[PDB]
Amino acid sequence: ASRHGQKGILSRLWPAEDMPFTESGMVPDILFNPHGFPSRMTIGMLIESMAGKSAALHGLCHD
Amino acid sequence: GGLTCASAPQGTLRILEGPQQSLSGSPLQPIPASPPPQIPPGLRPRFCAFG
């Protein structure tokens, strides 16, 4: 689960070479279907993703 | 030589002790409002591409 009520079971363990790699070499470790947003309207997860990426990038800690 | 009823009182006084109101200044908060989260100055990119 996330901190926004988006609970779900673990359905697969996707091999690390079959995951979509980014142009920076990275590779996600969680894949989250984008269809839980439209009906549940948890816009706080889409802001937490950006806040946490900015934190990890700048060494900061946002509130 | 006994006690008899006398004339009815003509008025009543009720005493109470009361202090007064000061000026309205309405000093809401030490550091007031919700101060906004903001940009650290300069920052700089902490990541580069390969090549």
From Swiss-Prot, chain A:
Subunit structure as annotated in this protein's UniProt entry: Component of the RNA polymerase I (Pol I) complex consisting of 13 subunits: a ten-subunit catalytic core composed of POLR1A/RPA1, POLR1B/RPA2, POLR1C/RPAC1, POLR1D/RPAC2, POLR1H/RPA12, POLR2E/RPABC1, POLR2F/RPABC2, POLR2H/RPABC3, POLR2K/RPABC4 and POLR2L/RPABC5; a mobile stalk subunit POLR1F/RPA43 protruding from the core and additional subunits homologous to general transcription factors POLR1E/RPA49 and POLR1G/RPA34. Part of Pol I pre-initiation complex (PIC), in which Pol I core assembles with RRN3 and promoter-bound UTBF and SL1/TIF-IB complex.
Lineage: Eukaryota, Metazoa, Chordata, Craniata, Vertebrata
Notes on the domains: The active site comprises the fork loops, the loops and the rudder that stabilize the transcription bubble and assist polymerase translocation.
Protein's job: Catalytic core component of RNA polymerase I (Pol I), a DNA-dependent RNA polymerase which synthesizes ribosomal RNA precursors using the four ribonucleoside triphosphates as substrates. Transcribes 47S pre-rRNAs from multicopy rRNA gene clusters, giving rise to 5.8S, 18S and 28S ribosomal RNAs. Pol I-mediated transcription cycle proceeds through transcription initiation, transcription elongation and transcription termination stages.
Annotated organism of origin: Homo sapiens
Amino-acid positions noted as binding RNA in the UniProt annotation, renumbered to this chain: K7
Associated disease: Treacher Collins syndrome 4: A form of Treacher Collins syndrome, a disorder of craniofacial development. Treacher Collins syndrome is characterized by a combination of bilateral downward slanting of the palpebral fissures, colobomas of the lower eyelids with a paucity of eyelashes medial to the defect, hypoplasia of the facial bones, cleft palate, malformation of the external ears, atresia of the external auditory canals, and bilateral conductive hearing loss. TCS4 inheritance pattern is autosomal dominant.
Domain of life where this protein originates: Eukaryota
Name this polypeptide is given: DNA-directed RNA polymerase I subunit RPA2
Similarity annotation: Belongs to the RNA polymerase beta chain family.
Subcellular location field: Nucleus, Nucleolus; Chromosome
UniProtKB/Swiss-Prot annotation, chain B:
Subcellular location: Nucleus, Nucleolus; Chromosome
Region described as Disordered: 18-41
Transmembrane segments: none
Highest taxon listed in the record's lineage: Eukaryota
Residues that bear Phosphoserine: S26, S34
Extent of Pro residues compositional bias: 29-41
Something else known: It is in an antisense orientation to and overlaps the gene of the DNA repair enzyme ERCC1. This gene overlap is conserved in mouse, suggesting an important biological function.
Family per similarity comment: Belongs to the eukaryotic RPA34 RNA polymerase subunit family.
Subunit organization: Component of the RNA polymerase I (Pol I) complex consisting of 13 subunits: a ten-subunit catalytic core composed of POLR1A/RPA1, POLR1B/RPA2, POLR1C/RPAC1, POLR1D/RPAC2, POLR1H/RPA12, POLR2E/RPABC1, POLR2F/RPABC2, POLR2H/RPABC3, POLR2K/RPABC4 and POLR2L/RPABC5; a mobile stalk subunit POLR1F/RPA43 protruding from the core and additional subunits homologous to general transcription factors POLR1E/RPA49 and POLR1G/RPA34. Forms a heterodimer with POLR1E/RPA49. Part of Pol I pre-initiation complex (PIC), in which Pol I core assembles with RRN3 and promoter-bound UTBF and SL1/TIF-IB complex.
Described function: Component of RNA polymerase I (Pol I), a DNA-dependent RNA polymerase which synthesizes ribosomal RNA precursors using the four ribonucleoside triphosphates as substrates. Involved in UBTF-activated transcription, presumably at a step following PIC formation.
Descriptive protein name: DNA-directed RNA polymerase I subunit RPA34
Organism: Homo sapiens (Human)
Residues of the full protein shown: 103 to 153 of 510
